[PDB]
Amino acid sequence: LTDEELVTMSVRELNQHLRGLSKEEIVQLKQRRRTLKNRGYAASCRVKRVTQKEELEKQKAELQQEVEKLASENASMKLELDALRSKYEALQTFARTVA
Amino acid sequence: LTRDELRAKALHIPFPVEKIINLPVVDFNEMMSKEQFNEAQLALIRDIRRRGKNKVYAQNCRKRKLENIVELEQDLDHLKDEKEKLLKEKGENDKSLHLLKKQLS
DNA sequence: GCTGCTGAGTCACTGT
DNA sequence: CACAGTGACTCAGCAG
Numbered sequence: 009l010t011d012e013e014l015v016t017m018s019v020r021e022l023n024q025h026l027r028g029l030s031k032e033e034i035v036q037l038k039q040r041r042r043t044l045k046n047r048g049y050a051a052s053c054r055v056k057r058v059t060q061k062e063e064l065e066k067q068k069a070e071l072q073q074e075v076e077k078l079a080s081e082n083a084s085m086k087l088e089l090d091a092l093r094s095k096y097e098a099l100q101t102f103a104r105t106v107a
Numbered sequence: 108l109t110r111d112e113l114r115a116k117a118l119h120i121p122f123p124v125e126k127i128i129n130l131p132v133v134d135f136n137e138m139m140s141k142e143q144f145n146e147a148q149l150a151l152i153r154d155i156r157r158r159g160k161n162k163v164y165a166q167n168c169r170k171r172k173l174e175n176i177v178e179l180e181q182d183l184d185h186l187k188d189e190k191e192k193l194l195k196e197k198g199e200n201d202k203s204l205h206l207l208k209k210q211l212s
Numbered sequence: 213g214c215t216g217c218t219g220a221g222t223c224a225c226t227g228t
Numbered sequence: 229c230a231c232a233g234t235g236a237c238t239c240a241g242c243a244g
Contacts, residue, residue, distance in 0.1 A: 019214065042214090047237060049216055054235075057172070064179040071186040078193040082200065089204050096207060132230065162221060164233055169219085171233095 009037075015044045111155050118148050127152055128159030 009025070014037075017025070022041065026034060108116075111124045120127075122138060130138060135156070144152070 043238075045215080046217095046239075049218085050237065053217070061176065061179070064176065064183065068179060068182050068186065071183065071190060075186055075189050075193060078190065078197065082193060082197050085197075085200055085204070089200055089207075092204070092207055096210075158222070160231075161223085161233090164231090165221070167232090168234060 011044055014041050015048065017041070111159075114151060115155065118151050120144075120148055120152060122152075124155055124159070127155050 014022075022038075029037065109124065115122070115124055115127075126138060127135070139152075
């Protein structure tokens, strides 16, 4: 019995493969299956933590470039807004100097 | 008595397991000096030190993984707040530019 | 009893 | 050489 064949086997079909096995070899085969199942649980846990980390890092990189772009364009527009307000105010004081 | 301590006692190693693991390498070498250990004693001492130190490395490596996820989720939390704050600032600037252009044409 | 999960210890590596 | 880090495997032990 190869590895994944023993892991995919249900506990009901496992009892159908008790041909010529002693009481102990039935035990060791059950612990062999449990060990193989535990190896898959650890691998399944490691995969789950990796995708979570990679996804959180993907969202952070996207939001960091969004915030960096937002801060940059806001500073540039604020420059043009302040310049336009300066010319508007300068024209305001000149408008107060008329007859 | 731990399994490590029993094995060290069985091989007549006179040093405490704690000192084998935790001593800085300079003090560890001083402790090992002036001895006469055979290959079996040297191998067990090296095995106890390596396992004892690697145990803590794995502990720290798993603690860092958990702390790194907490820091990432905090980074996301602040970035969403900074994005919201920057959008409000962009709105006040867009509304001020609009009012100025309206005042003119 | 089994199933999933998970905290640790260990191994076989790689990195500084 | 030393120490340090890390994915994978292992077992133990708890919850379901």
